[PDB]
Structures are given as C-alpha cells and as structure tokens.
Design a protein around this ligand. Structure first.
Ligand SMILES: *[B]([O])([O])[C]([C][C]([C])[C])[N]C(=O)[C]([C]C1=[C][C]=[C][C]=[C]1)[N]C(=O)C1=[C]N=[C][C]=N1
Ligand SMILES: [Ca+2]
Length: 356
C-alpha cells in the first residue's frame, strides 16, 4: 500500500525507506491493526487532532498531582487531554534543567502507532486501523512511578483502586518514557501483571548513549527494549545499548541526517504552553521514544492479522521472540560494545512469520 497522505512520501522515511524504514508498505497489504488496542503511556494526547480523530479511545489521566497534571485537583480523571508539559524556568525540575516548550510527545508517539492513513491528510501511521488507548502519566517535569505502575495495571486490564474497570484492555503497551535506576519491584510487579494478562510491553531503551541496564523500565524483565536507528540503518548518537536491548526501530539520527531524514514525523502541535496557545501540526522528533512505537505498532499488526485468520494471539514471550527473529539485520555495522539488538523491526517479515 502506498497511502495518499500528502506528507508521507517526503517525510516518513521511517515507514518506507529501504535501509532505515520498517517495511510498512508491504505490511499494510496484510494488516493495518484493526481490532487491536495499543495503550500509549505518555504525556497524554490532543484528542481532536484531525489526523487522529477516529482512532482514539477516551483513556484516562493517572497523574495524581495537580502541579504535574496542570489540572485543578490531584484526582485521576477520565480522558487523557495533554494540558502541556512546558516548564518556564531553568532549574525548576532538577538542578541543571533548562526551560522547555510543551512537547506534545504523547500525540507524536500515538501518531506513530495509529495516525489516520490514506485519508488525504497530513502523515501516516503504522497500525492505522488499531485504536490508541491514551493513558496520561507524564506532565510538568515528568511523573511518578506509582502513577505509571497503576497505568500499566489498568491499561492491561488489571484492577486499580479508585479507577473504573478498563473496558478496553490493551494487547500492547508502549512506554516512551524512563529514567535512571535498575527496575524496582514496583515497575517489575506491574509489568509482570500486564504480561500475565497477555499484554506485550514495549519500551524505549533511553537516549543517554549508555547501557540500558542502568535505566527503567528499559532494564525490566519481560519487556521489549527498543534502541534507535538512523535513516542509514545505523545506531543513533544517543541510543542506549547493551545486552538488554532486543531490537531497534527508526528513532532518527538528529541534525547529522538533516531535515527530514534526522526525525520521525507525526501529528502534534506548535503550541508552546497550553493547547490553546498553538494549533494542530506535524512535528519531527528524534529519540528511542519514536523507535519504541514502531515496534509496538508492529506487534499490533501481528495480533490483528492472527485474529483476522481466526488464529490465537501470541503470548508476550512469543511476540518478543518473533519481533527479534524477524528483524532486518542492520545495513551498517553496529560496534560490538554498543549492541542494539538483532536488527530493525520489519513489519512485513513479522507478519509473514506469524502467519506461516
Ligand atoms: B524520548 O523522548 O526518546 C524519551 C525516552 C525515555 C525512555 C528516555 N521519553 C521521555 O523523555 C519522556 C517524554 C518527554 C517529555 C517531555 C519532553 C520530552 C520527552 N519523559 C520522561 O520519561 C521523563 C520526563 N521527565 C522526567 C523523567 N522522565
Ligand atoms: Ca493522515
């Protein structure tokens, strides 16, 4: 499938480039992810983005701190509206931090997963007939482990005290988020719960040019840890590495690769603070954050295709095995001391092997 989205051909190398893309055009002849739900645990979403409307569920906001959520109370509430995670001053978050505009990171990531495709608008997405379940866990200066842990539980169909039962348990969780430290019991237990319910958990390796073993949830057991490659098919300057990294997806090499080649392109906003301070747009972002949702979406394509053939969905361990075994070996040599898994996720190869 060559979809008709106006910016797809020029911008979205990460979908269709022969060295650095995930073989999406061929995959899309087989599956678009229909009937699957991917939970995006992130900064929230702009739910009326014209290129997302139709592929989103209401979701929920798990941030239990008014200052972080920019909401009026510390309550968790239905919906996942991103209120903006901007920070006006240097050093507000940690000693050393610098002021940043609102990321709309969750809307970008959600676009990689399920941006409306072949609709003659904006950009394409990978699992563009799936639904995204947005689960807002990050706000101003980030979020809290307890919020993220309960979000994992709820997203995967587990019970959380204080939140109504999830009517849309997700086959796949994407966490384009993390921080320093080995995986603790809190993360690991929530993740083990999701896995026990059949949910595959896909996470960003991190962007510290460091061993993924030193970060969480990257270093958690049972997860798919995703490094980042360039348009060239080689390691990005920022990607974390190590034996824990399972495979890579396109994350974008940044300025060395230019515009558009250095960035992944999806739905977002130019708003600097509140949603109202800007308008809907398409944004180019780089990171393991962008790589992870390509892999989460491919998982969704696989689960969907199987259901369509009346076959059983893959258990998490099988999904991770399939993603690794079917990845495209890197077209550029990866240095021995910075491994980033078995290859670049290959949407077509994954589908072909699952349907054999
Ligand atoms: B990514 O953008 O590549 C990245 C991956 C992560 C595993 C290191 N995600 C983040 O940095 C997320 C989302 C984000 C929010 C705002 C600006 C840019 C990105 N954030 C976090 O995980 C986070 C944020 N603040 C504190 C701690 N962690
Ligand atoms: Ca589109």
């Amino acid at each position: 499938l060559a979809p008709n989205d106006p910016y797809y051909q020029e911008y979205q190398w990460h979908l269709h480039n022969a060295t650095g893309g995930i073989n999406a055009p061929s995959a899309w002849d087989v599956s678009q992810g229909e009937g699957v739900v991917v939970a995006v645990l992130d900064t929230g979403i702009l739910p009326q983005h014209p290129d997302l409307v139709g592929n989103l569920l209401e979701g929920y906001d798990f941030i239990s701190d008014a200052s972080t959520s920019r909401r009026a109370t510390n309550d968790r509430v239905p919906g996942a509206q991103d209120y903006g995670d901007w920070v006006e001053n240097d050093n507000e978050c940690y000693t050393g931090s610098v002021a940043e505009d609102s990321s709309w990171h969750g809307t970008h990531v959600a676009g990689t997963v399920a941006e409306q495709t072949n609709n003659g608008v904006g950009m394409a997405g990978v699992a563009h007939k799936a639904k995204v379940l947005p689960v807002r866990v990050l706000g101003k200066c980030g979020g809290y482990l307890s919020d993220i842990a309960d979000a994992i539980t709820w997203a995967s169909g587990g019970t959380v005290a204080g939140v109504p039962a999830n009517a849309n348990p997700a086959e796949v969780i994407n966490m384009s988020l993390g921080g320093s430290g080995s995986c603790d019991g809190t993360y690991q237990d929530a993740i083990n719960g999701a896995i026990s319910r059949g949910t595959t958990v896909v996470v960003a390796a991190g962007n510290e040019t460091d061993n993924a073993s030193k970060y969480r949830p990257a270093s958690c057991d049972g997860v798919v840890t995703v490094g980042a490659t360039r348009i060239t098919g080689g390691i990005t300057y920022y990607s974390n590495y190590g034996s824990r990294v399972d495979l890579s997806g396109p994350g974008g090499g940044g300025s060395v690769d230019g515009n558009p080649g250095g960035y992944v392109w999806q739905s977002g906003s130019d708003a600097a603070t509140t949603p109202e301070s800007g308008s809907y747009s398409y944004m180019g972002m780089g990171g393991t954050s962008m790589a992870s949702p390509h892999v989460a979406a491919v998982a969704a394509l696989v689960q969907s295709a199987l259901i369509a053939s009346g076959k059983d969905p893959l258990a998490p361990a099988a999904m991770r095995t399939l993603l690794k075994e079917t990845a495209r070996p890197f077209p550029v040599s990866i240095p021995t001391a910075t491994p980033i898994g078995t290859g670049i996720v290959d949407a077509k190869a994954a589908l072909a092997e699952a349907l054999e």
